């Protein structure tokens, strides 16, 4: 069909919509509140204990940056994907773990201090050494340098906005732990309005509902990526003979990945008109990995009942 750009187009106002800015700022505030509530239920003792024993940190790093980009490259090679799709899936695989991974860790409730130290060290290591692995694994795709286009200020900004609420919660619990129920109720209400806000988003913010015309095989690989990540994390944890507490948290931290940086790099590298439904692909990937997370939540609770 020769080489033509997709008919998918974005509204001119979408670049600086006040509604989009309001959604971004309320999402940032929401992440701040949920991170504060999440770091409330941790203490520095286990943080220091897990930092002194970096075996879990080492296994998480070797799973996230050693095999995950390799399996992303292999999956792109075997499914005969296009250059843009292969680059997108490779960047998604190379991404470090996100904060929603820590939210699912709270849902599973296993070794939260290890989870937070894992995610902060993963983000730091990503910042340090993601462009080199991206250049190594992107031979034949995007001959451009791309080193100066991966976000750097965004990474440190996210790291600070994650660390500060956690430290605030830890120091609040350590020094004066008498206002627990109020902040937990605030967590419940922030979660409720988060459900309301995500419903509002999915209703009146997506637009151009043509994601179903997206290629089924890229849907299949976006489906398989979180599942294979979860399975690889679980087995790699199992064969290194640690305690049973860390299995689920390390496996599901390895499986989950961030998608904001992938969207930013795809948007800055290519025009919106060139990219078709792959622009909405990160949203689909995040939604489906959340679905897998909920499925494993249900499986874990069903197992623990029996």
């Amino acid at each position, epitope marked *: 069909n*020769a*080489s*033509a*750009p997709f008919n998918f187009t974005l509204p001119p106002n979408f670049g600086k919509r006040p509604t989009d800015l309001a959604l971004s700022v309320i999402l940032v505030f929401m992440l701040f509140f949920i991170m504060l509530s999440l770091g409330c239920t941790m203490e520095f003792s286990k943080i220091k204990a897990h930092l002194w024993k970096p075996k879990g940190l080492a296994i998480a790093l070797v799973a996230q940056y050693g095999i995950m980009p390799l399996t992303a490259f292999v999956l*792109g*090679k075997v499914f*005969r*994907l*296009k*250059n*843009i799709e*292969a*680059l997108a899936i490779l960047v998604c695989g190379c991404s470090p773990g996100g904060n929603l991974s820590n939210v699912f860790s709270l849902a599973m409730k296993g070794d939260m201090n290890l989870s937070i130290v894992m995610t902060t060290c993963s983000t730091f290591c990503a910042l340090g050494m993601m462009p080199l692995l991206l250049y190594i694994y992107s031979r*034949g*795709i*995007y*001959d*451009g340098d791309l080193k100066d*286009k991966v976000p750097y200020k965004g990474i440190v900004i996210s790291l600070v906005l994650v660390l500060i609420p956690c430290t605030i919660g830890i120091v609040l619990k350590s020094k004066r732990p008498q206002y627990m129920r109020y902040v937990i109720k605030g967590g419940m209400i922030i979660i409720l309005l988060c459900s309301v806000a995500v419903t509002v988003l999915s209703a009146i913010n997506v637009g151009k509902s043509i994601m179903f015309a997206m290629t089924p095989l890229l849907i299949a690989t976006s489906s398989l990526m979180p599942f294979i990540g979860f399975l690889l994390g679980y087995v790699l944890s199992a064969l290194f003979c640690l305690n049973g507490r860390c299995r689920r948290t390390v496996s599901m931290e390895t499986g989950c990945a961030n998608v904001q940086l992938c969207s930013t790099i795809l948007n*800055v*590298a*290519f*025009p919106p*008109e*060139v990219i078709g439904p792959l622009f909405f692909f990160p949203l689909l990937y995040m939604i489906f990995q959340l679905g897998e997370g909920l499925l494993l939540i249900a499986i874990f609770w069903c197992y623990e009942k029996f």
Partner: antibody, heavy 121, light 113 residues
Framework: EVQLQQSGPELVKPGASVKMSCKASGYTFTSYIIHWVKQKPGQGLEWIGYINPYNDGTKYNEKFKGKGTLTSDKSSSTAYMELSSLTSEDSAVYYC??????????????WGQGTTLTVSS | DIVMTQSPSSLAVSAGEKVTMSCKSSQSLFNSRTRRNYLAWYQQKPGQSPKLLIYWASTRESGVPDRFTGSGSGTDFTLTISSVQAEDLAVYYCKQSYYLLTFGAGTKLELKR
């Protein structure tokens, strides 16, 4: 359809800086990249480099590192190419071509009328 | 780098004869991930800018006559005209874009006497 419009013939001294203008207004200028091809008389085509107007990303051929300089203007939908280092043998015909670029430039479907440059006294 | 070599580089044919040029490139410029076989054939009539004929070394650009067929894989490629006419006399380059944009030496078409 769309056509690629060249600046026109240019006559320049051996020591000077010459800028070439290539204009195309038939599509979204940021969706495609613009290449430059140098053709000495009867010596065949030779690639120079391409520029991506969306992010102002430029890639150069091996020999054109010293003199190759590509700049683009989104507002004017024009691509500019500058040499700033000229010799008597540098005179040739330069073409600007448009190619779709996803990860690798595919093929130059459309070409300009060409620019003839002469270097002498 | 990749260097493109064309063997004939010069030939003269009559109306009925077929030319069947061939340029062997340097190595196997076939993409395993996407079975596209990156290659493009261009035609440049004298005093005119080059015109694209074949892309992906197998697919012909719309608007070209059906007589222009290109078949090849790996390193060997061939463009055939079959029933060549008087307006097909030009220079063809079989440009490649697998790794770096390099053009071939070129072939010249003439008329026999």
């Amino acid at each position: 359809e769309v056509q690629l419009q060249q600046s026109g013939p240019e006559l320049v001294k051996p020591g000077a800086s010459v800028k070439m203008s290539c204009k195309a207004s038939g599509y979204t200028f940021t969706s495609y990249i613009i290449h430059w091809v140098k053709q000495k008389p009867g010596q065949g085509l030779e690639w120079i480099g391409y520029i991506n107007p969306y992010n102002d990303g430029t890639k150069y051929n091996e020999k054109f590192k010293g003199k190759g300089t590509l700049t683009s203007d989104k507002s004017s939908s024009t691509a500019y190419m500058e040499l700033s280092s000229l010799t008597s043998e540098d005179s040739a015909v330069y073409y600007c071509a448009r190619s779709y670029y996803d990860g690798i430039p595919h093929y130059f479907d459309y070409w300009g009328q060409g620019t003839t440059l002469t270097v002498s006294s | 780098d990749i260097v493109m070599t064309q063997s004939p580089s010069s030939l003269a044919v009559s109306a009925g004869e077929k030319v069947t040029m061939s340029c062997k490139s340097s190595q196997s410029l076939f993409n395993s991930r996407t079975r596209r076989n990156y290659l493009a054939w261009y035609q440049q009539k004298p005093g005119q800018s080059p015109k694209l004929l074949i892309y992906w070394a197998s697919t012909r650009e719309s608007g070209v006559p059906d007589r222009f067929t290109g078949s090849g894989s790996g390193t060997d490629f061939t463009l055939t005209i079959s029933s060549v006419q008087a307006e097909d006399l030009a220079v063809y380059y079989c440009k490649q874009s697998y790794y770096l944009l390099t053009f071939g030496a070129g072939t010249k078409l003439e008329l026999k006497r």
